[PDB]
Design a protein around this nucleic acid. Structure first.
Ligand SMILES: [Mg+2]
Ligand SMILES: [Zn+2]
Ligand SMILES: [Zn+2]
Lengths: 83, 1347, 99
DNA sequence: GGAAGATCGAAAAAAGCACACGCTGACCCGCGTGGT
DNA sequence: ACCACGCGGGCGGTAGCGTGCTTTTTTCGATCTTCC
RNA sequence: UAUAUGUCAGCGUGU
């Protein structure tokens, strides 16, 4: 469960883009069918995203890097399939 | 998709382009078959099919026939929603003027045609003639002719002159004129002209002509020839019971217009006489006017309900218009409403939601979960299951609300905390359960109040609710930074009862191993909650490294305090709970817990405190009874003594020794003293009534009386209310404000007779009426402030500006309302603060002043600190974080994208109810007395020593400051002109001593030199009269003003000169001019001719002679001119009196070296503080009175007017004990200072007299300077909140506030283009606001537009 | 009173008012200001478009919630279109610029 | 020394007057006038 | 000769919409006074 | 989700 987001706020440092990052992570979990980086204690998607943000496993840079890696591997796979 | 909105008037061709057909019949519905009639207001051919993908005739009724127009009835087969977009047009038989460009002052037709509006109205409504082309005759072109004058002109010349009559003539006049030639002629006429009114009219017409020329608008387009119509779906015919249909005002207006047009067409086709066609044209024009604006001109047309119909303009403007009823605010789905009860078991982040409400609100989520889990296969099955309320439905509802926040909001949303996010908990019953600790934030009581609940849907909304609007996140008030979560009624009482000591209780003096043993003993009944014992307490403290170190020691405390220590977190010390815990003590303990540990421990501590307080208040069983209000035995004696004293006073008055006024004053004073004595005696009796036998000895202890316990603990009640309950009610006031002689000497415990109750009803009704009437004014002020500060957000981190405002403690002759610490708390400095007397830096230039910096500043005895202010922010289209300061809600510096303007407006508006609107109601002391010990400093003083050695002031604006030993200016006083000084500058004074004395009844004339007095230019009976005294008989000379003196005495100026034994004037020390003192009117002189006088002697004597809270705040924020503004010196120089005209005094200011173009006409009854030949600087008071803010801005600068406004507003708010930070007032002031008028055009293209936004001028000047060219000189202008709001770049915001018709007309005439920057415009459009989490997204758009 | 989705008005396509007819609570000016005081950008957008006026937004939001996706499409509120048509009914032309 | 610009004062007009919620009443009709 | 569309809808009265709000803007009539 | 057909006045309640 979650009662406060102060530690997540200080991890992000602005409290405005933290909402955006958490929303992106929650959309990745709920729609993209990803997997949490933290144990799933029957929490909601937003709470799980905030919890895994708290310990620094997810931020804007990390999400961008993972998205870039997934795009590059999908491009490599489709190029190999075409060839 | 779109970036901006363009508004302009519509040409007939473009209006025809909009329309998909022409309406020619007034029929709407056949009323036999519900199909729309052909060529009517409702038509399928013109607007669209009634049914989706169906034809009116019925040939095609399938999607396969989409986009093909039927041939039998000409109805396109598309979706019926096209009926909401397709429009139509009506071809008017004759031209008709547009009312919005007709009677919206200033009249655009009249202003452009340069001829009076009444002439426009007369020629338009077919009552007179106007000449389109005058010809080679005596008749002018724009000449108004009546019927018989037109006949005379016609018989004089048959066809030489061409005069028409009606809107056609106006259209011809507008079309014939040339905009460029008229503009250049007007410019060349304005260049040579000099009349001020003519200059204003010419520049207004020039601005209008330039606006017309720059845009694509044409004047003839202001006369309507084709009339657009609304789509039918926007004016629907609502079905009713049976065949009846709801009436629509727009449909009736359109039908009337169509009927008038058809009648005019059939009259024109039949070649009707002139009178009939003229009447038809006038009536058609009136119908069109009623359609566009019903009540704008004449009596509004009434319908079947004996009431004016709602026109097109009536349904767009006003509070009920589309802007304020359906765009800025709207009804929403997934929302509910219910009454609120109290849930004591809830946590700070939880709320109680009824099962039915949650089931109804979360229906789509339940449907989705049921479909996912397989209990249902279709939406209908899920609907049936949730309707039947199956068992699995409850489990699904529990699953979906696990971590889904809900927004709870009260009906009056005064400030930010009026809506908060809570985690729902399913409860039975029918009432929402609310956490008690948040009630103070909601201003909600469980007396029948109702609350609304909203359900966020998207993940982003849920995360914003959890992270931004959660209850736990809101712990400090954004208005002033004070905490908002404090125990109020029962927690404080319970903690106070638990943390108390009785000198002889059960189990006293024993030693306990710890708090657990104390709890065991209390529960087992072997010890009392107030027993004084010794317990072993282990307290943890934070070292330098932050590690917790334990210390175990024996402490003398009570059982209750030891029990309460269990819930206290480890990091806190034991000193917080080892005392009687009142409201202040609990608040301080919570503040210490928050400061030391953090947020989550503070929340847990607050919840545990609430639980323990409730439990032990229940255990205590405290109750109020009739015996708890003890009446002192000495009340009767005091009352009898007071009655004897007032009887003696009445006897003295009857004897005639004392008159009515002083007798009434003494009676009031006696009754006040009696009331004070009664209250003191009752408090003494109540506070220590209880006496306890300890070891057989009587001992006094703090009373356990329930009323006294409630009063002392701070739970509920105060000194005044307890005084009314147990002592006399005191004096009461009449509705006019006068105090009644006989007070209410009856307690509430005792019986108030009929007279006393009737007396108290006056004050009760006055207070209730004020409270009832305050709401509308407070709401209007809050709306105006929100509008004027809607578009201000933080868009930058640091300007780099070195400017700012200097903050000093506020003092007015005896009190220090706000020390420097609160004024400079959480604000970024603008310059290095030097250590006093050492020229060494104490704080760096750009460091935010937190608590440690404030402690450093106060420990070094610093009085003035220059800090960055919002009004001095160099950022354009927004402010910066550094110039703004620390966020009051969160201790850190504010973040980019925060909507500071809305927060400031709400923070100012919310305490409006606590203010007062109704106005309420000895002579001023003649001397200045020092209340403390310290040195005396004299500021802005030119004094002289008298014969006795005392110092007398010869300066108008003199400041006397009492300074302590540490250099802090402890006291400030304003020394008037001609005031004697007991002690000089730099001389120490003792407390209670008087340093300055003066006579306020009359103003004297003080000589700066010593010598004989010689007369100059006064003759008895012309300029002076030698009048004998009533008793002494001495003949004193009185100078008469211009009213009494004759023409011969007009140029005779009375004068007194100081001369030596030779007989010539003594030259003024430091001035070549000799010592002359001119006697003004009504001046009395006692000294005789040739009498030797010393320096400082009084030559002559001149005799010398509010609004509540909300009105004063409104006047200050509106920059309203005072009734009798103080006259200030525009330029610095010597003063001179000229010749008197119009019953006014002429003033000439002569600079030392500059020119003398400035003259003033002071009104006669306005007193003149300045003398004949004194020196005055800029912004110097010439006539006493209120200072107009515009004059302050013009003559002293932006900083001075900002300081004045914030000081006045803060004084008004502090009179009622309201704490509001100055950041909000500074933000409002900056929003008011947003326009500037040019002076020198320079290299810029700005018009010399034009008024434009300050940011635009700054940007243009920066761009011009970057290229090495010259800039443009500007003068900032002060505007009221509503005036500044209306005069803004975005016309959408101005139109949605008030005066929609005028704003829309001006925008259409000027062809303004509005870019969607700001909160209101984005809210109206529907996109993300450029603030908060959406702000960053908007930045991306600004990144995409540049690329 | 409680309503998830119900009948809508004709001219403005907004939820009805009152408890006798199934209607929603009014998010007035003060609530909008309070939301603007917070960040609450997406919450305000969903209150102004998805929940009140945007008919396509309403349908898409309902389908997404039923499908388990908590994402919204802002769209174009119908109240602004009604206001634009009302202003256009007079002699004043008002339009949106795509530049 | 009299026409024109400046000033004062009365008058007329326009715009504003918090939020939320609940209930009830009306959503024809009467002359009139040509069509039949 | 009776009747159904139709249309505009104001009461009261040689018309004009007023009687217990406040603030801002504009207009005109009377008075002054400036000066060539 | 789109369902069966809602607009104006007057009165009242709570801040
Ligand atoms: Mg209440
Ligand atoms: Zn057809
Ligand atoms: Zn700044």
């Amino acid at each position: 469960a979650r009662v406060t987001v102060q530690d997540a706020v200080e991890k992000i440092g602005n409290r405005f883009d933290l909402v955006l990052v958490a929303a992106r992570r929650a959309r990745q979990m709920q729609v993209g069918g990803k997997d949490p980086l933290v144990p799933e204690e029957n929490d909601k998607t937003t709470v799980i995203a905030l919890r895994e943000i708290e310990e620094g496993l997810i931020n804007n840079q990390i999400l961008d890097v993972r998205e870039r890696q997934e795009q590059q591997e999908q491009e490599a796979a489709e190029l190999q399939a075409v060839t | 998709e779109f970036d901006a909105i363009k508004i302009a008037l519509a040409s007939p061709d473009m209006i025809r382009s909009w329309s998909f057909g022409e309406v020619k019949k007034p029929e709407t519905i056949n009323y036999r078959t519900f199909k729309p009639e052909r060529d009517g207001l409702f038509c399928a051919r013109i607007f669209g099919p009634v049914k989706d993908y169906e034809c009116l005739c019925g040939k095609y009724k399938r999607l396969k026939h989409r986009g093909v127009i039927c041939e039998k009835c000409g109805v396109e087969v598309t979706q019926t929603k096209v009926r909401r977009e397709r429009m139509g047009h009506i071809e008017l038989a004759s031209p008709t003027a547009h009312i919005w460009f007709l009677k919206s002052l200033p009249s655009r037709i009249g202003l452009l045609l340069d001829m009076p509006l009444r002439d426009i109205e007369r020629v338009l409504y077919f009552e007179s003639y106007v000449v389109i082309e005058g010809g080679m005759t005596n008749l002018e072109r724009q000449q108004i002719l009546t019927e018989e004058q037109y006949l005379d002109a016609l018989e004089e010349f048959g066809d030489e002159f061409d005069a028409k009559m009606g809107a056609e003539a106006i259209q011809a006049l507008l079309k014939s004129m040339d905009l460029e030639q008229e503009c250049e002629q007007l410019r060349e006429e304005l260049n040579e002209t000099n009349s001020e009114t003519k200059r204003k009219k010419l520049t207004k017409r020039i601005k209008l002509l330039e606006a017309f020329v720059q845009s694509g608008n044409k004047p003839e387009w202001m006369i309507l020839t084709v009339l657009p119509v609304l789509p039918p779906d926007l004016r629907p015919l609502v079905p009713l019971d049976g065949g009846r249909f709801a009436t629509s005002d727009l449909n009736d207006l359109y039908r009337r217009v169509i009927n008038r047009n058809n009648r005019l067409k059939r009259l024109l086709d039949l070649a009707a006489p002139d009178i009939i066609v003229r009447n038809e044209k006038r009536m058609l024009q009136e119908a069109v006017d009623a359609l566009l604006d019903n009540g704008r001109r004449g009596r509004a047309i009434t319908g079947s309900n004996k009431r004016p119909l709602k026109s097109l303009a009536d349904m767009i403007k006003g509070k009920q218009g589309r802007f304020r009823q359906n765009l800025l605010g709207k009804r929403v789905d997934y929302s509910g409403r219910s009454v609120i009860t109290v849930g004591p078991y809830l946590r700070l982040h939880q709320c109680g939601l009824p099962k039915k409400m949650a089931l109804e609100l979360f229906k789509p989520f339940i449907y989705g979960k049921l479909e996912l889990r397989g209990l249902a296969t279709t939406i209908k099955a899920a609907k049936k299951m949730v309707e039947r309320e199956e068992a699995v439905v409850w489990d699904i509802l529990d699953e979906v609300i696990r971590e889904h926040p809900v927004l709870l909001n009260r009906a009056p949303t005064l400030h930010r905390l009026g809506i908060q996010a809570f985690e729902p908990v399913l409860i039975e019953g029918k009432a929402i359960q609310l956490h008690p600790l948040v009630c103070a934030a909601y201003n909600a009581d469980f007396d029948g109040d109702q609350m609304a609940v909203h359900v966020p849907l998207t993940l982003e909304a849920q995360l914003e609710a959890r992270a931004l609007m959660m209850s736990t996140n809101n712990i400090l008030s954004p208005a002033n930074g004070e905490p908002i979560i404090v125990p109020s009624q029962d927690v404080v009482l319970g903690l106070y009862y638990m943390t108390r000591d009785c000198v002889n209780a059960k189990g006293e003096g024993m030693v306990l191993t710890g708090p657990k043993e104390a709890e065991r003993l209390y529960r087992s009944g072997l010890a009392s909650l107030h027993a004084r014992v010794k317990v072993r307490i282990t307290e943890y403290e934070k070292d330098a490294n932050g590690e917790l170190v334990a210390k175990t020691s024996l402490k003398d405390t009570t059982v209750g305090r030891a029990i309460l220590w269990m819930i206290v977190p480890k990091g806190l010390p034991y000193s917080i709970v080892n005392q009687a815990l009142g409201k202040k003590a609990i608040s301080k303990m919570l503040n210490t817990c928050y400061r030391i540990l953090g947020l989550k421990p503070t929340v847990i501590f607050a919840d545990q405190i609430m639980y323990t307080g409730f439990a032990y208040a229940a255990r205590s069983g405290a109750s109020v009874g009739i015996d708890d209000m003890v009446i002192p035995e000495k009340k009767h004696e005091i009352i009898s003594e007071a009655e004897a004293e007032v009887a003696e006073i009445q006897e003295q008055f009857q004897s005639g020794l004392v008159t009515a006024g002083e007798r009434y004053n003494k009676v009031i004073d006696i009754w006040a003293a009696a009331n004070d004595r009664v209250s003191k005696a009752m408090m003494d009796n109540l506070q220590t009534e209880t006496v306890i036998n300890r070891d057989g000895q009587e001992e006094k202890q703090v009373s356990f009386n329930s009323i006294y316990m409630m009063a002392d603990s701070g739970a509920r009640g105060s000194a005044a209310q307890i005084r009314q309950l147990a002592g006399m009610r005191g004096l009461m006031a009449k509705p006019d404000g006068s105090i009644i002689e006989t007070p209410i000497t009856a307690n509430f415990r005792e019986g108030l007779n009929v007279l006393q109750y009737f007396i108290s009803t006056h004050g009760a009704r006055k207070g209730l009426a004020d409270t009832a009437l305050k709401t509308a004014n407070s709401g209007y002020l809050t709306r105006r402030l929100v509008d004027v500060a809607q578009d201000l957000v933080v868009t930058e981190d640091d300007c780099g500006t070195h400017e700012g405002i200097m903050m000093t403690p506020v003092i007015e002759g005896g009190d220090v309302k706000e020390p420097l610490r609160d004024r400079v708390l959480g604000r970024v400095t603008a310059e290095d603060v030097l250590k006093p007397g050492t020229a060494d830096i104490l704080v760096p230039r750009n460091t935010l002043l937190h608590e440690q910096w404030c402690d450093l500043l106060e420990e070094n005895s610093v009085d003035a600190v220059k800090v960055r202010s919002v009004v001095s922010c160099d950022t354009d289209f927004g402010v910066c974080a550094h110039c703004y300061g620390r966020d009051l809600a969160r201790g850190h510096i504010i973040n980019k994208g925060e909507a500071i303007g809305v927060i400031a407006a709400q923070s100012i508006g919310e305490p409006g109810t606590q203010l007062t609107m109704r106005t309420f109601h000895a002579a001023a002391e003649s001397s200045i007395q020092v209340k403390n010990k310290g040195s005396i400093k004299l500021s802005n003083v030119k004094s002289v020593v008298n014969s006795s050695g005392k110092l007398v002031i010869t300066s108008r604006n003199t400041e006397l400051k009492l300074i302590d030993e540490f250099g802090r200016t402890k006291e400030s006083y304003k020394v008037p002109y001609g005031a004697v000084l007991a002690k000089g500058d730099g001389e120490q004074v003792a407390g209670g001593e008087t340093v300055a004395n003066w006579d306020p009844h009359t103003m004297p004339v003080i000589t700066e030199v010593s010598g004989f007095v010689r007369f100059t230019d006064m003759i008895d009976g012309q300029t002076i009269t030698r009048q004998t005294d009533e008793l002494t008989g001495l003949s004193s000379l009185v100078v008469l003003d211009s009213a009494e003196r004759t023409a011969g005495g007009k140029d005779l100026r009375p004068a007194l000169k100081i001369v030596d034994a030779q007989g010539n004037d003594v030259l003024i020390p430091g001035t070549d001019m000799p010592a002359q003192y001119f006697l003004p009117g009504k001046a009395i002189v006692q000294l005789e001719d040739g009498v030797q006088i010393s320096s400082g002697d009084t030559l002559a004597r001149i005799p010398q002679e509010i609004t509540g809270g909300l009105p004063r705040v409104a006047d200050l924020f509106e920059a309203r001119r005072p009734k009798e503004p103080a006259i200030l010196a525009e330029i610095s120089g010597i003063v001179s009196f000229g010749k008197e005209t119009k019953g006014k005094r002429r003033l000439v200011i002569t600079p030392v070296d500059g020119s003398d173009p400035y003259e003033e006409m002071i009104p006669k009854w306005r007193q003149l503080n300045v003398f004949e030949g004194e020196r005055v600087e800029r912004g110097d008071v010439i006539s006493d009175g209120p200072e107009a803010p515009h004059d302050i801005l013009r003559l002293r600068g932006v900083h001075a007017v900002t300081r004045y406004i914030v000081n006045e507003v803060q004084d008004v708010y502090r009179l009622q004990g309201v704490k509001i930070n100055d950041k909000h007032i500074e933000v409002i002031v900056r929003q008011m200072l947003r326009k500037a008028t040019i002076v020198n055009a320079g290299s810029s293209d700005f018009l010399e007299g034009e008024q434009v936004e300050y940011s635009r001028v700054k940007i243009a000047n920066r761009e011009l300077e970057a290229n090495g060219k010259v800039g443009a000189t500007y003068s900032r202008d002060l505007l009221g909140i509503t005036k500044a709001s209306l005069a803004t770049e975005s016309f959408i915001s101005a139109a949605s506030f008030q005066e929609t018709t005028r704003v829309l007309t001006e925008a259409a005439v000027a062809g303004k283009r509005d870019e969607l920057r700001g909160l209101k415009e984005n809210v109206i459009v529907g996109r993300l606001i450029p603030a908060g989490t959406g702000y960053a997204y908007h930045q991306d758009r600004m990144r995409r537009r540049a690329a | 009173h409680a309503r998830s989705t119900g009948s809508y008005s004709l001219v403005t396509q907004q939820p009805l008012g009152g408890k006798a007819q199934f209607g929603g609570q009014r998010f007035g000016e003060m609530e909008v200001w309070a939301l603007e005081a917070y960040g609450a950008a997406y919450t305000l957008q969903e209150m102004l478009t998805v929940k009140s006026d945007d008919v396509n937004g309403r349908t898409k939001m309902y389908k997404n919630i039923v499908d388990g996706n908590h994402q919204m499409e802002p769209g174009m509120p119908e109240s602004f279109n009604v206001l634009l048509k009302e202003i256009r009914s007079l002699g004043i032309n008002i339009e949106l610029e795509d530049e």
